[PDB]
Amino acid sequence: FTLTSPYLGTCSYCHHTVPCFSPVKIEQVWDEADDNTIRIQTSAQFGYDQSGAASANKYRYMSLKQDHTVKEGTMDDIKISTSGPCRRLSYKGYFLLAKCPPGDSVTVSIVSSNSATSCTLARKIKPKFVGREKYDLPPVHGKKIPCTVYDRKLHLPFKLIPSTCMVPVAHAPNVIHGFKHISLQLDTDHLTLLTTRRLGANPEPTTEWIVGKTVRNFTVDRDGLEYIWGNHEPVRVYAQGGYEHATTVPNVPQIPYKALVERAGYAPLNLEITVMSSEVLPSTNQEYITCKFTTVVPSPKIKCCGSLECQPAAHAGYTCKVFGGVYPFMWGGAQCFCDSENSQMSEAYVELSADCASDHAQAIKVHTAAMKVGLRIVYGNTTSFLDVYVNGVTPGTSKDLKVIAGPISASFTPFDHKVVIHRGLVYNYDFPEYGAMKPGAFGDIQATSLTSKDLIASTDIRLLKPSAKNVHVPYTQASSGFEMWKNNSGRPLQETAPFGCKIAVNPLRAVDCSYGNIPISIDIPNAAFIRTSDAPLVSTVKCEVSECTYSADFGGMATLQYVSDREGQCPVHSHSSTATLQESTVHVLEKGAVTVHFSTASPQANFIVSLCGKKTTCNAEC
Amino acid sequence: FTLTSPYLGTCSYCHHTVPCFSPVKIEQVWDEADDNTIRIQTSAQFGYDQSGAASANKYRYMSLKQDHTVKEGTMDDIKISTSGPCRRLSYKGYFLLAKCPPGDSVTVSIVSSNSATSCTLARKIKPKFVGREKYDLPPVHGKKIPCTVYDRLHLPFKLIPSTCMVPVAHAPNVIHGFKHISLQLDTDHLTLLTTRRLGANPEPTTEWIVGKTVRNFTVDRDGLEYIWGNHEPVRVYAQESGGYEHATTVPNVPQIPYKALVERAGYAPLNLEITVMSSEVLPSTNQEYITCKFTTVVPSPKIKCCGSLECQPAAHAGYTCKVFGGVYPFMWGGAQCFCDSENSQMSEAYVELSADCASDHAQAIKVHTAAMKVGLRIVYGNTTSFLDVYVNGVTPGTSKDLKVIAGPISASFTPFDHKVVIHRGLVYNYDFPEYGAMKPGAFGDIQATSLTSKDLIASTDIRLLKPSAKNVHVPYTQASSGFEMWKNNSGRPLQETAPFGCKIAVNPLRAVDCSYGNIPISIDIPNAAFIRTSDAPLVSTVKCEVSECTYSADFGGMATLQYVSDREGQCPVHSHSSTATLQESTVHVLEKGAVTVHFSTASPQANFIVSLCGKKTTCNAEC
Amino acid sequence: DFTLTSPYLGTCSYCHHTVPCFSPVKIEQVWDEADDNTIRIQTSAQFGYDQSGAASANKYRYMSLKQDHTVKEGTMDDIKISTSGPCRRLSYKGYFLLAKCPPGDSVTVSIVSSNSATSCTLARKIKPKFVGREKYDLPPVHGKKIPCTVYDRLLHLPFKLIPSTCMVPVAHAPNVIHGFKHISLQLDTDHLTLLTTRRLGANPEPTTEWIVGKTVRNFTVDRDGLEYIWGNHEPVRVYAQGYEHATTVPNVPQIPYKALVERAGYAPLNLEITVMSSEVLPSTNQEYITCKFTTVVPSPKIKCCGSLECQPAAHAGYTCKVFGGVYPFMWGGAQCFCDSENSQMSEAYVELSADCASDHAQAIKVHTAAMKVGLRIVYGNTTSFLDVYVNGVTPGTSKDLKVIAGPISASFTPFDHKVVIHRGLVYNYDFPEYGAMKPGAFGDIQATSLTSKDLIASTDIRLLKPSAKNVHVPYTQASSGFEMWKNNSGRPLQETAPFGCKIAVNPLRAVDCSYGNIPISIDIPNAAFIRTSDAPLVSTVKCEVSECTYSADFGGMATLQYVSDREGQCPVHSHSSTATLQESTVHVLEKGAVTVHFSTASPQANFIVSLCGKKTTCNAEC
Numbered sequence A: 001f002t003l004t005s006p007y008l009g010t011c012s013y014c015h016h017t018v019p020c021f022s023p024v025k026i027e028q029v030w031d032e033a034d035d036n037t038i039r040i041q042t043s044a045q046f047g048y049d050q051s052g053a054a055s056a057n058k059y060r061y062m063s064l065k066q067d068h069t070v071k072e073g074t075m076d077d078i079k080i081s082t083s084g085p086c087r088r089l090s091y092k093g094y095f096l097l098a099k100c101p102p103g104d105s106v107t108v109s110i111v112s113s114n115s116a117t118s119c120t121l122a123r124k125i126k127p128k129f130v131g132r133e134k135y136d137l138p139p140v141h142g143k144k145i146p147c148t149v150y151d152r153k154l155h156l157p158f159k160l161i162p163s164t165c166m167v168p169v170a171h172a173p174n175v176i177h178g179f180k181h182i183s184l185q186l187d188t189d190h191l192t193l194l195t196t197r198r199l200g201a202n203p204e205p206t207t208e209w210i211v212g213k214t215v216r217n218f219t220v221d222r223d224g225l226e227y228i229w230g231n232h233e234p235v236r237v238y239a240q241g242g243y244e245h246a247t248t249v250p251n252v253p254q255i256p257y258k259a260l261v262e263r264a265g266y267a268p269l270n271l272e273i274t275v276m277s278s279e280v281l282p283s284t285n286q287e288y289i290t291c292k293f294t295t296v297v298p299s300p301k302i303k304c305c306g307s308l309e310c311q312p313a314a315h316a317g318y319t320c321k322v323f324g325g326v327y328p329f330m331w332g333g334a335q336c337f338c339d340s341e342n343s344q345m346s347e348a349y350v351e352l353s354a355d356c357a358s359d360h361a362q363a364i365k366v367h368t369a370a371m372k373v374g375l376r377i378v379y380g381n382t383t384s385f386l387d388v389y390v391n392g393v394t395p396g397t398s399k400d401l402k403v404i405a406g407p408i409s410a411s412f413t414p415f416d417h418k419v420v421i422h423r424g425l426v427y428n429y430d431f432p433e434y435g436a437m438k439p440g441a442f443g444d445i446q447a448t449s450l451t452s453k454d455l456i457a458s459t460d461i462r463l464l465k466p467s468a469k470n471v472h473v474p475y476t477q478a479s480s481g482f483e484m485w486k487n488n489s490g491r492p493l494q495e496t497a498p499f500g501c502k503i504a505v506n507p508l509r510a511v512d513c514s515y516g517n518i519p520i521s522i523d524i525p526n527a528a529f530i531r532t533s534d535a536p537l538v539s540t541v542k543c544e545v546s547e548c549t550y551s552a553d554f555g556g557m558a559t560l561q562y563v564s565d566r567e568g569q570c571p572v573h574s575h576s577s578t579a580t581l582q583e584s585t586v587h588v589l590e591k592g593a594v595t596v597h598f599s600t601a602s603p604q605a606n607f608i609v610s611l612c613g614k615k616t617t618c619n620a621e622c
Numbered sequence B: 001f002t003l004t005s006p007y008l009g010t011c012s013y014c015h016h017t018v019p020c021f022s023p024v025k026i027e028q029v030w031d032e033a034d035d036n037t038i039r040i041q042t043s044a045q046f047g048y049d050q051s052g053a054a055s056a057n058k059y060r061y062m063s064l065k066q067d068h069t070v071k072e073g074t075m076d077d078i079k080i081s082t083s084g085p086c087r088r089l090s091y092k093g094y095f096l097l098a099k100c101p102p103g104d105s106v107t108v109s110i111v112s113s114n115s116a117t118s119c120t121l122a123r124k125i126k127p128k129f130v131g132r133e134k135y136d137l138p139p140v141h142g143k144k145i146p147c148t149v150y151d152r153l154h155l156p157f158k159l160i161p162s163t164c165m166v167p168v169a170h171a172p173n174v175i176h177g178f179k180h181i182s183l184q185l186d187t188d189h190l191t192l193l194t195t196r197r198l199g200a201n202p203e204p205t206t207e208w209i210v211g212k213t214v215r216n217f218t219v220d221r222d223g224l225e226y227i228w229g230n231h232e233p234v235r236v237y238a239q240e241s242g243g244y245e246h247a248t249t250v251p252n253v254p255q256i257p258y259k260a261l262v263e264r265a266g267y268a269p270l271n272l273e274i275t276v277m278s279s280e281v282l283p284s285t286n287q288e289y290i291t292c293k294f295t296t297v298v299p300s301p302k303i304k305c306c307g308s309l310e311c312q313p314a315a316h317a318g319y320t321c322k323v324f325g326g327v328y329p330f331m332w333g334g335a336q337c338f339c340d341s342e343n344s345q346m347s348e349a350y351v352e353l354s355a356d357c358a359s360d361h362a363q364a365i366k367v368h369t370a371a372m373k374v375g376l377r378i379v380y381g382n383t384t385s386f387l388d389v390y391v392n393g394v395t396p397g398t399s400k401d402l403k404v405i406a407g408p409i410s411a412s413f414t415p416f417d418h419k420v421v422i423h424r425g426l427v428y429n430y431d432f433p434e435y436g437a438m439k440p441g442a443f444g445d446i447q448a449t450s451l452t453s454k455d456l457i458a459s460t461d462i463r464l465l466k467p468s469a470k471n472v473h474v475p476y477t478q479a480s481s482g483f484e485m486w487k488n489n490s491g492r493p494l495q496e497t498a499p500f501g502c503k504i505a506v507n508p509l510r511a512v513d514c515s516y517g518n519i520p521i522s523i524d525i526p527n528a529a530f531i532r533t534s535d536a537p538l539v540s541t542v543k544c545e546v547s548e549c550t551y552s553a554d555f556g557g558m559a560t561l562q563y564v565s566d567r568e569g570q571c572p573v574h575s576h577s578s579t580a581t582l583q584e585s586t587v588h589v590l591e592k593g594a595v596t597v598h599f600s601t602a603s604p605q606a607n608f609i610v611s612l613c614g615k616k617t618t619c620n621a622e623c
Numbered sequence C: 001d002f003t004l005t006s007p008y009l010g011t012c013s014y015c016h017h018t019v020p021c022f023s024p025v026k027i028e029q030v031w032d033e034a035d036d037n038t039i040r041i042q043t044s045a046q047f048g049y050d051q052s053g054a055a056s057a058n059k060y061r062y063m064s065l066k067q068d069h070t071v072k073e074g075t076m077d078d079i080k081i082s083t084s085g086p087c088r089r090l091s092y093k094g095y096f097l098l099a100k101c102p103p104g105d106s107v108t109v110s111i112v113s114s115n116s117a118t119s120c121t122l123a124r125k126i127k128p129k130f131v132g133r134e135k136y137d138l139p140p141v142h143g144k145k146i147p148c149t150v151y152d153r154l155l156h157l158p159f160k161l162i163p164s165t166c167m168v169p170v171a172h173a174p175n176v177i178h179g180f181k182h183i184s185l186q187l188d189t190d191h192l193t194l195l196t197t198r199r200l201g202a203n204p205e206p207t208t209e210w211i212v213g214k215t216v217r218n219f220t221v222d223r224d225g226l227e228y229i230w231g232n233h234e235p236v237r238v239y240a241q242g243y244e245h246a247t248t249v250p251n252v253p254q255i256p257y258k259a260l261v262e263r264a265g266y267a268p269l270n271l272e273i274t275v276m277s278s279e280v281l282p283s284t285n286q287e288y289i290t291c292k293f294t295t296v297v298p299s300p301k302i303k304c305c306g307s308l309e310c311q312p313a314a315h316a317g318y319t320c321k322v323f324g325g326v327y328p329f330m331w332g333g334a335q336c337f338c339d340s341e342n343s344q345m346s347e348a349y350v351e352l353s354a355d356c357a358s359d360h361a362q363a364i365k366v367h368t369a370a371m372k373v374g375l376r377i378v379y380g381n382t383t384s385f386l387d388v389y390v391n392g393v394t395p396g397t398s399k400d401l402k403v404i405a406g407p408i409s410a411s412f413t414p415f416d417h418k419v420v421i422h423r424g425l426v427y428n429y430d431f432p433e434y435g436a437m438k439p440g441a442f443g444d445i446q447a448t449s450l451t452s453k454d455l456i457a458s459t460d461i462r463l464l465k466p467s468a469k470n471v472h473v474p475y476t477q478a479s480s481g482f483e484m485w486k487n488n489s490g491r492p493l494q495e496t497a498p499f500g501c502k503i504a505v506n507p508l509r510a511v512d513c514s515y516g517n518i519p520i521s522i523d524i525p526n527a528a529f530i531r532t533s534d535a536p537l538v539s540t541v542k543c544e545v546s547e548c549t550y551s552a553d554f555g556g557m558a559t560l561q562y563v564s565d566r567e568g569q570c571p572v573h574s575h576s577s578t579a580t581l582q583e584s585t586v587h588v589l590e591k592g593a594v595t596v597h598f599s600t601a602s603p604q605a606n607f608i609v610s611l612c613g614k615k616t617t618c619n620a621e622c
Ligand SMILES: *[C@@H]1O[C@H](CO)[C@@H](O[C@@H]2O[C@H](CO)[C@@H](O[C@@H]3O[C@H](CO)[C@@H](O)[C@H](O[C@H]4O[C@H](CO)[C@@H](O)[C@H](O)[C@@H]4O)[C@@H]3O)[C@H](O)[C@H]2NC(C)=O)[C@H](O)[C@H]1NC(C)=O
Pocket: A176, A178, A181, A182, A183, A215, A216, A217
C-alpha cells in the first residue's frame, strides 16, 4: 500500500507545444543500460486505484483541475512514445520502464476517454548495441555476452544489474594463408569490428569496422598475429642434495625445451622444460573511482528585500552565486514586496549517479612487477611441475625439485605508469592526479571508492540569473568526462598488447606474453641419474635422413644405424639450434636401427645429433 | 474454401521484447519489387471465419492458449507496421502485402479488444525508387516506365512486370558555345546526369545532382550525348556552337547521304546518293547460365537419440551438412532423448531459386565476333531503291533490281567484351566466372543453364553452427547474395558507355547505329537507267559565282552558275572535292544560262570543283 | 460567424491506398515559411460547423463518400494530421489547418471516424527549422527570447504570419583563457552552436564554424583585439593587454583625447575630446523588393475542334504554350468531339506569396556617405557636447561652442555599391539590376514595393503537354531564387565588418567604427580662458615613477617634485604617444609633490610629461 500520492508538475510540452502544469510530469530519465532500455520518472502513480491498493492494472493521478481530486484510470490506457511506439515492461509506482526507438525526446501520455494529457521531455537517447557487432534487435541466434540492464528519498527505482545479452556472431571469414600472408575474405550483413595486432614486439594494432564484402590482407611477421573479428573469439595465425644444472629457457608458452644433462661418468639425462604459463603481475595503487555524476539543485533560498552573501559550503562539486534585483514586487514567481532590493542564491552540486556502482572506471597507477611461471620439467622417468617467481632468489618450493628462475633477460611491460580499468578492460591512459581534475575530461569527478569516500569534483557549473516569471534556477555545466572518455576510450590493451599478451583484470596481469629468455637453475635429485650402468656399450653411430619438409611442425625423418652390446635407453638430442628433435629418449635395441623425427626451417641443414654418448652428423634437402 | 488452418510459431519479439510462441508468426518476407511494396508470410489465415469460408473481411488464428481453439476476428483490426504506419492492399490466406516506409524490422499485430499479440521480424527494407530520379511518392505527374511489382509451391502474390510512374526533371536551361555546353540545372530532387562522347573515346561521366549548379562539357567535334534524369537522351554537336559495277567507299554514319558521280565513257554522269539508313552489329551469343537471388532451404534436423550420425554427401543444389555431437541432454532439454554426451544432430541445408528468380535474374553470356547488317538506301537517276546487306566481301543484298555487296568494314570494332551480363534490358561488360567456377557472394554465386532449374550449381559459403540445447533450431551463417550484391554495384549500362554512340539493344544482342570507319560498296547499276550523251542540249562554258556563304552550317552556301546550253534538259550537279557538298544533286537546266544551287562547308576560304552535266568549274568565297 | 460556402471534393494522389482518388480533405497548398516549426495546411473540408455553417467549436463537415451532395458531419475530435509521425493541430480555420509536424517528407490529412478512413496526402517537403545560432529540437523551458516570425492562432482568410518572439537556448559559456596575444576558447556544448569571430582591425579575416561537444579554439589577438559571438550569446570582444584651435583626434569611440591649449600670456587650457559615437550614413537607393513567389495556374482554356493561338497577356511572370491534338473524343481525352483536331492553351504566372510581406529582402544600391560624430568636449570648468558632420564645412550648432570637424583622414566604408537587407541583416551582394533577372538566383522576381508596384519575374516556367485522362495542366519551374539565396546568404556584415563597425538597419549605418584621425577646429569662448592670473610661479620640476604595469588600463604611477610660489591649477599632459595620462589637470600646492596616474604598453618607456609651463622626463621598467 502507498503512503504518498500522485502530484502535478510544470512541463514544457503538453499535447500542445505550450508549457503546461500537468500530471505525468517527467522529472528525470535514465539511459545507461547496455540494453536498449529506459527508466522514466513521472509524477503519476501506477499499480493503485483510488487508494494505495493492489491493482495490477490501475494507475492514479491528480485532476485536470486542482481539486486534489485523485481520480483513477486503467493502466491499460497509458502509453509511452519517443519518436515512435514504445512498449513498457514494468510499473513501479512513480516509475516507468520501456524500450524505445530513436531518442530525440520522451513523451508520456494518457489516451483515455478523449481527454489527452501528455508531458514530454527534451532528452536524447542514442542507439545502443553492446557487441562488436551492430544489431537493431537481439538475435534469436547468436552469443551470450556480459552486459548490464534494468531489473524487472533514495532507492526505489528499477536497479541496474549486470547480466547477459545476446549479440549476433559474424559470418566466419573465409581465410587464405599464404607466404607471410593472410587475406581475409569478409562478408557481413551488418557492421562488424575487425581488430588485429602482431604477436611480436611491435604489434602495430589495427581496428576497423567493416560492412558487406571486402578482402583484407595482413602481413605475418614470422611471430604470427591475432585477429578478433566481430565478437568472434580471437583466432591467431602464424608463419608456418643433487645436481645443479644451469640453462636458459626462452619465455614462450607451450613450447618444450629439450636439453641434455652431461655429467662425468653418468649417463645423459632426459630434460624437457615447458613454460606452461607466464604471468606478469605488477603492483597496483588504485587512485580513485569515477563515473557519470548527477547534479543536485536544491530549491533556491530567496530573501525578500535583503542581501544574501553566500558562503563556501564545503562539499562534492559545490557552487553558488548571489543574484541581485531578482524578482519584482507582484508575482514574477514569488511573494516578495521590494523590486530592486531582492536577492536569490543559486546553489548546486554533484553526486554519483544512482548507477555509478554498476558502470564506473578505476584510475590506477602501475609500478614494476614480478612474474610467476608455470614450469613443467621432465627428467628421466618422472615429470614434475612448479610455479616460480622470476628473480635470482625465490625457489619454487616443489617438494622433490628445487628450481630458481633467474632474472628475466629483458624487463618488459604492456602497461604504462598510469592505467584505467573500465569493465574487464584496461587502457593505458594518463588520468589526472587525484584532486587535479579538469572538467568534461576523464576523471572530472573522483572518489577513493563507491561509498563516496570524500568525492572531489570539477564540472564547470555555471549559475545563471533567473528571469522573473517562476522560481527556476538555471545553469549550464560541462559534459560528463566519463561518458566522454567512454565514447572515446581506445581499443583495450587486451587488443593492442605488444607481445601477444593476454591482459587480465582482477589481479592486473599480462598472461602468456612471449619475449626473451629465462635463466633457470635446476637441482635434480641424484636419485634419478643413471651412471654408465646401461649394460650396452654403444659404438659406431651414423646418420641417414629418409624424408624432410622445410619449416613444418615435424616433417623431418632420420634413421640411425649403429652397434650396441646390449639393450638400454638412450637420450637423443641435437647439439645445434639449426634443428630440434621431437623425442628426447629412444629404446636402443641390438638391431642397430633407430628412427627419429625432427623439425627444422632450412633447405640444406647441418646438425650434430647425439645418442647416449656418441655423436654424428646428418644431412638432407628440404 | 480452405483445407488448412492457422498455426502457431516461435517469434523473437512479441509486444514485449521477449521471444514468444504466438500466431501471426512471420516466416519470410519479400523485398524485391521495384515498387515500394512488400510481401509478408504469416501464420494466420485471412478471408475466412470459423471455417474456411468466404468472409471478405474476416481472419482466423490459433488461440492465446493452445486448445486448438481457432477463434476468429474481423480483418478490420489487423494492422502492419515497420517503423511507422503500413497500409495493406491484399489478403491471401496466409499472406499479406503492404507498402511500408523505412525498413528496420517488420511487425504484424492484432489490436482487437484489448488483447494485443504481435510478432515482429528482423528484416531490413530499403528505400526503393526505380527512376533515374529520386522520389518518395509516385507523382500525379510524370512518365511511365518499365518496372516490376507484386500482383493484387505457388500461392503468393506473383511478381509481374508492368509500368511505374517516375517524375521527369526540370529541363536544363542549356547554352551552346564554342565546342561548349554549359548545363544550368535546377532540381527539386536527386537526378542522375549521364554523358558520353560520340567519338572514339567517350570518357563517360555519371553524377547525381541536386538543387542548382552548372555543368560545362567539351564538345569534341563529334558531339556528345547527355541523359538527364530519365529524360530522353538528347545529344549535341559542334557546328556553330547485267549492268555497270561501281566501286566506292561510304563512311559508316547513319542518316548522312553520300553524293557521288558515276563516270562512264560516252555515257552521261549518274545521280548516285547512298544513305546508310541503319547499321547493326550482331555478335554471336553463347548464353552460359542464369543467376538470381537464391533461397536457402533448411529441413528439420535429423537427430538420433544416443548414437552417431555420419552424414553423407547428398548431391544437389548448394548442399551442406555437418555432424554435431553431444547435442542435447535428457527429457526436456533438447528433444526427448535419454543420453547426455552420446547425442548427435545432423545439420543440413541447401539453396534453390527464389520464388521470383524468374521475374528478376541476369544472363551470363560470352560474346564472340559478329556480323553487321546495314540498311542501305541507294538512289540512281529517277529511281531510289533500298536493300539490307551483311558487311563482308561476299553476301549480296538480294534487292531484286540492284545487286549490292558491301565489302569488309574498314576496322573491326565492338562495344562488347568476350564476356557480358544482361540484367533487364541492360547489358554490362562483366567478367562473370565460368560455369561451375563459382565464388560466393560475388556475381554468379549460383548458376543454372535455365530457369527450369536445369542442373543448378551454387556456392554460398553456408556455415552450420552447433545448436544450443533449449530448442531444436538449426543455426547457420551464409554469404551474401552475389546477385543482389552485383545489382547494387552494377555499373552504368553499356547503352550509356558505348564508345561510338552505339545504341545497345537486347533480345538479339546488338549495337544499333554505331558510327565508325568507312564501308566499301560495289554497286551493279542496271544499264537500263544510264543515259548516253543523249541530252540534246549541248552544254558549254560554265562558270561559278558564290552569292552568300556561312561557315560550318547546315546549308549556308549559295552559288550560281552561268553558262550556255543548246536546249533544255536535266543535269546532275556534284562536287569533286570533300571540302564541300551540294544540297541538291540534280538541276533543271534551261536556256537562260543561270543555275542557283545550295551547298554546305566548314571552312573560311574553300576551293572546290563543282560539276554540271559534263562540264566542270571552280568556285570561291569567304565564309 | 456562419458560412456561405461548403466543403468540396478534390482529386488526390495518395488516399490510404497508394492509388490516386477523388476524396474530401484534398490538400491544395501548404505553407512552410515560419521560423517556428509550424505548418499551414489548406484542405477541402470545413471545420467549426455542423450540418449548416454554424458555431460548433468541435465539429467539421465534408462531402460524402459518394457524391450525393450529402454534406454529412463529424466531430472535430476524429481528425488527425500526420507527416512521418504524430502531428498536433493548434487551430481550425474553416478550410485551413495549422499544426506542428516533425520530419517533412509528405503531408497526410485524414479522418479516422467510425471505421471509414479517408486520407489525402501531399508530396511536399518540410525541413527541420531552428531559428537561433543554436540547434534545438524543442524550445527550451530555459533560454533567451529572440526575434522570429510565426503563424497566428486567432484572398485573406488564412492564419497570418506575424513577427514575434521565439525562445532559443543559450550555450554553455566557454571557459576562456587569455594569453600572449592569445585566446584559447575551451568549448563544451550539448548541441550544435555557431562560433563567429572577426578582428577589430583593418583586416578582420572573419571566421565562422559550427561546433559540437568538446574542443579548444585558439585565436590570435592582433593588438586591435577581436570580437567573438558564440551561439546566440551576446558578442563579447577581447583585446591585447573666441580662440580657434586646430587638433586632430583619432576616430575611436570612448577614448578621450587630452591636449593643451597654448596661448601667449594666457594660462594653458583643460582640453579633452571624446568621440562618444560615430555613424557612417551612406545614401540608399532601394531598387526592388523580392521574396518567395507563388505560381498561379488558371484552368486551361480548351477549344473543342479548333486552333488556339495564345497571345502575349502582359503581366507578372506570364507564360503560355499552345498544345495540339490534346484530348481524343470523350474519355478519350477531355470531353469533346474531334481527336487530332484539339488544342489546349497552358498558361500560368507568378505573384507574391501570401507572406511576401513578413519575409522579404531589399535590393539596395549604396553610394558614398556622410558621417556624424558624437563629440564631447571639456574646457576648464565646463563640458559641452555637439554632433558634427565630418566635412570641412558644417559647424556643429552647439550654442556656446562652434566646432567644425574637417574631412576624415581616409574614406572607408563597410559596404559595397550593392547591398541586400534581409531582416535586420545586411549582406554585400551583387543583386542583378531591376529587370535583369536570372531565375532561381536571387532577385528572380522583383517589385518596387510590396503593393505589387509593377512586379517583373523570370522563373523559368516550362509548360508540358498534358496527357489525356484528366484536365490537368503540368509544368516544371525553377527554384525560389529567394529561398535559395536565403539558405546561402553568408554571415551578415554585422559580423564581418572590417573595423569593428556595428552595422545598423533602418537608416543603413556603420555605428562606432574605428579608423583614421579626425581633424577638428574648436572655437573656445574667450570667456573661459585664464590669463596668467594664477597667483603662483612654477619652477624646477622633476619626475619619479613609483610603480608601473605594462599594457594595462592605468597601471602607471609617477610623482612630481617641484617648487611653486603659490597655489593654482596646472594642466598635466604627455608630449609623446609612448604614454598618456589618466588625468589632465592637477591642484598644485606649495608642498611640491604631485601624484599622477598613467598608462603605457612598453617595458622601458621614455616620455616627456608637462606641468603648467614646465617639462621633464620620466623613466621606469614595467
Ligand atoms: C591479398 O593476398 C591474396 C593472397 O595471395 C591475393 O590473392 C591473389 O592475388 C594474386 C595476384 O594476381 C592472384 O594470383 C593469380 O592467379 C590468378 C587466377 O586466379 C591470375 O589472374 C594471376 O595472374 C597475374 O599475376 C601473376 C603474378 O603476378 C602474373 O605473373 C600474371 O602475368 C598475371 O598478371 C595470378 O597468378 C590470386 O588469384 C589472388 N587470389 C585471390 C582471388 O584473392 C590478393 O591479390 C591480395 N589482395 C589484396 C587486396 O592485396
